[PDB]
Amino acid sequence: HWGYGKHNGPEHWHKDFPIAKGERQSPVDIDTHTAKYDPSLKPLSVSYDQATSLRILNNGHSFQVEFDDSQDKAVLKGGPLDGTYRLIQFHFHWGSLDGQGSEHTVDKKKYAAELHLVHWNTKYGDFGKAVQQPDGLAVLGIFLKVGSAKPGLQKVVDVLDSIKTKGKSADFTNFDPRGLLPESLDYWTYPGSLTTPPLLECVTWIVLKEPISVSSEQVLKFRKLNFNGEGEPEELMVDNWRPAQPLKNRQIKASFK
Numbered sequence: 211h212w213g214y215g216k217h218n219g220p221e222h223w224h225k226d227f228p229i230a231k232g233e234r235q236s237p238v239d240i241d242t243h244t245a246k247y248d249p250s251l252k253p254l255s256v257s258y259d260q261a262t263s264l265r266i267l268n269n270g271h272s273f274q275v276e277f278d279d280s281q282d283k284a285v286l287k288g289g290p291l292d293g294t295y296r297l298i299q300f301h302f303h304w305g306s307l308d309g310q311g312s313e314h315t316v317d318k319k320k321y322a323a324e325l326h327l328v329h330w331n332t333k334y335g336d337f338g339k340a341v342q343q344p345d346g347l348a349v350l351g352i353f354l355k356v357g358s359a360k361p362g363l364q365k366v367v368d369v370l371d372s373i374k375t376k377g378k379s380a381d382f383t384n385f386d387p388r389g390l391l392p393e394s395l396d397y398w399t400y401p402g403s404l405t406t407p408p409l410l411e412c413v414t415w416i417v418l419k420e421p422i423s424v425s426s427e428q429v430l431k432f433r434k435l436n437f438n439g440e441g442e443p444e445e446l447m448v449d450n451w452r453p454a455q456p457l458k459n460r461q462i463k464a465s466f467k
């Protein structure tokens with residue numbers, strides 16, 4: 211099966227998922243000097259006041275916090291989007307060292323980690339239908355740099371001990387994702403793909419310019435998770451990021467001059 215090691219990592223994925231060599235793959239490097247300011251772009255509208263988290267899970271390649279998406283509770287609109295996108299989960303990618311871990315890069319700079327908030331377009335009725343459409347998903351990408359702790363992240367960090375290995379889950383209610391957002395909502399956007407198999411080209415990426423900062427101790431706890439299941443030989447969950455893919459015939463647009 212696919213993963214991030216030497217014999218099953220990103221350079222091998224195309225053998226099972228040929229779209230890995232597709233025209234609109236993610237992540238990409240954001241070259242700040244060639245991104246185009248688009249004054250037509252709207253401000254983002256994040257409405258997470260009524261979010262309902264359910265549980266946190268180690269899925270064997272990352273950990274994800276899941277939300278109830280049975281109704282318009284937590285949604286994203288505005289920006290480059292048409293319509294209402296419902297939050298279904300967030301997860302992280304991170305490195306073995308503080309100098310790597312993000313998927314997107316900015317002028318080739320790598321951050322310690324990257325947070326992805328995944329939302330799906332409710333006009334397609336369910337998530338499974340949404341992922342088959344070119345405008346089906348919108349993923350909000352937030353960079354993490356190492357500095358001062360983020361209080362809003364600590365609830366997550368403290369429960370990692372109970373989902374150490376693949377397939378473990380825990381109740382995780384009343385988590386407010388607003389605590390993970392930077393002060394500014396300025397962004398870059400481009401049409402892209404999932405960055406893990408099946409690598410479907412169904413994502414509008416929205417990557418925030420402003421990173422959030424987390425402490426060394428917080429990201430340290432991420433690195434103690436395991437890719438393996440319980441009872442199996444220990445493999446630490448680190449460097450679960452895909453390298454930058456060719457931009458090809460795409461333009462990155464910026465919301466800010």
Ligand SMILES: NS(=O)(=O)c1nnc(NS(=O)(=O)c2ccccc2)s1
Nearest residue numbers: 299326328341349403404405406408
């Ligand atoms: N890193 S990323 O592009 O946000 C994603 N990588 N895996 C993801 N999982 S997921 O949205 O739950 C998913 C699960 C099954 C099919 C399509 C998407 S999102």
Ligand SMILES: [Zn+2]
Nearest residue numbers: 301303326405
């Ligand atoms: Zn991701």
